[PDB]
Amino acid sequence: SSLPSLRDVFANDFRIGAAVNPVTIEMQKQLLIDHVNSITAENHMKFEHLQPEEGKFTFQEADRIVDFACSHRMAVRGHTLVWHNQTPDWVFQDGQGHFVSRDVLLERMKCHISTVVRRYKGKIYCWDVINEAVADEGNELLRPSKWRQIIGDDFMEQAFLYAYEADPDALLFYNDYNECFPEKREKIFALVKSLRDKGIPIHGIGMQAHWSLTRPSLDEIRAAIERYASLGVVLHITGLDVSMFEFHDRRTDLAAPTSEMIERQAERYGQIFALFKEYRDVIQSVTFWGIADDHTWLDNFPVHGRKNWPLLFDEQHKPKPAFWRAVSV
Ligand SMILES: O[C@@H]1[C@@H](O)[C@H](O[C@@H]2CO[C@H](F)[C@H](O)[C@H]2O)OC[C@H]1O
Ligand SMILES: O[C@@H]1[C@@H](O)[C@H](O[C@@H]2CO[C@H](F)[C@H](O)[C@H]2O)OC[C@H]1O
Known part of the structure; x- marks a missing residue:
């Protein structure tokens, strides 16, 4: 009640978002109502949860999310149309289990994008059209996927054109993680630049920001923001969390974060939101991949069965030290 509200603190900087599902909307309803003005479906707008069999569309869970957002004057980011x-x-596949042709996969891609995007047209203002197409390792530009294998390397151009046709007022995003590591940053930059140089309707880059206490550095974050902003795209931070474990740290037995983990996480969030506020002119939305530590996908990724504490509120929905530094930049 004396607590600052995130969306109000950042009212002149960017929207504040949370990834949700119908269960967490109930479990965390007051936090969401008190703090966010944007919502993303954590899972229920992905392909498997919208069209699990050809021509069987299951919008019920996504509808509940959109209804919640619309009834509390929250924006919605659509996540995600084309992903490996x-x-x-x-x-x-075809009826006999072999891979379809380019033309058939483009038909199915277009039908899915058209049906999904048109249903939420005028309620969802942007879409992650392509998720994580860039290779995360090695020297190649693109990760392998059945989308790319069957259609070809222009599969992304087609996806953006199909979504633009379905809703030409939506902002269309390329969304990816490890977006601040320089080698991957340059691949993402080259990919988006090449699409923009062909007049493809890609309006934004989604920086997932699945970050650790140490990585990426503040300078890497700054360099990535400027690198992407230089393309003239809008920037969203789309899945922010700050893991208590580095990538090499596969420990399972930690029952609580240490005092220094909690303090470093507070400092890290303060530094991050200071940098975001500094780039308020190009960052228009910051969405956390959750909202409080009683629900995070990092409990089971990348190590199944442990516990992580990545967000601004604890499992009892109380502000963590990171909350106070984040809102005081
Ligand atoms: O499934 C994807 C996952 O592979 C990816 O992996 C890590 C995310 O957290 C940091 F970014 C790590 O350094 C990555 O290697 O995260 C996105 C998720 O959708
Ligand atoms: O519940 C998990 C879900 O949170 C995860 O979401 C991905 C997390 O990494 C990025 F943000 C991706 O773009 C998200 O879609 O997907 C796996 C699921 O089990």
């Missing part, structure tokens, strides 16, 4: 994960096998 969480897409059913049927999409890439």
Whole structure:
């Protein structure tokens, strides 16, 4: 009640978002009502949860999310249309189990994008059209996927054009993680630049920001923001969390974060939101991949069965030290 509200603190800087599902909307309803003005479906707008079999569309869970957001004057980011994960096998196969042709996959891609985007047209203001197409390792530009294998390397151009046709007023995003590591940053930059140089309707870059206490550095974050902003795209931070474990740290037995973990996380969030506020002219939305530590995908990724404490509020929905530094930049 004396607590500052995140969306109000950052009212002149960017929207503040949370990834949700119908369960967490109930479990965290007051935090969301008190703090966010944007919502993303954590899972229920992905392909497998919208069209699990060809021509079987299951919008019920996504509808509940959109209804909640609309009834509390919250924006919605749509996540996500074309991704190498969480897409059913049927999409890439024919009746006899072999891979479809380029033309057939483009038909199915267009039908899915058209049906999904048109349903929420005028309620959802932007879409992550392509998720994580850039290779996360190695020297190649693109990660392998059945989308790319079957259609070809222009599969992303087609996806953006299909979504633009379905809702030409939506902001269309390329969304990715490890977006601040320089080698991947340059691949993402080259990819988006090349699409923009062909007049493809890509309006924004989504920086997932699945970050650790140490990585990426503040200078890497600054360099990535400027690198992407130089393309003239809008920037969203789309899945922010600050993991208590580095990538090499696969420990399972930590029952609580240490005092220094909690303090460093507070400092880290303060530094991050200071940098975001500094780039308020190009960052228009900051969405956390959750909202409080009683629900985070980092409990089971990348190590199944442990516990992480990545967000501004604790499991009892109380502000953490990170909250206070974040709102005081
Ligand atoms: O499934 C994806 C996952 O592979 C990816 O991996 C890590 C995310 O957290 C940091 F960014 C790590 O350094 C990455 O290697 O995160 C996105 C998720 O959708
Ligand atoms: O519940 C998990 C979900 O949170 C996860 O979401 C991805 C997290 O990494 C990025 F933000 C991706 O773009 C998200 O879609 O996906 C796996 C699921 O089990």
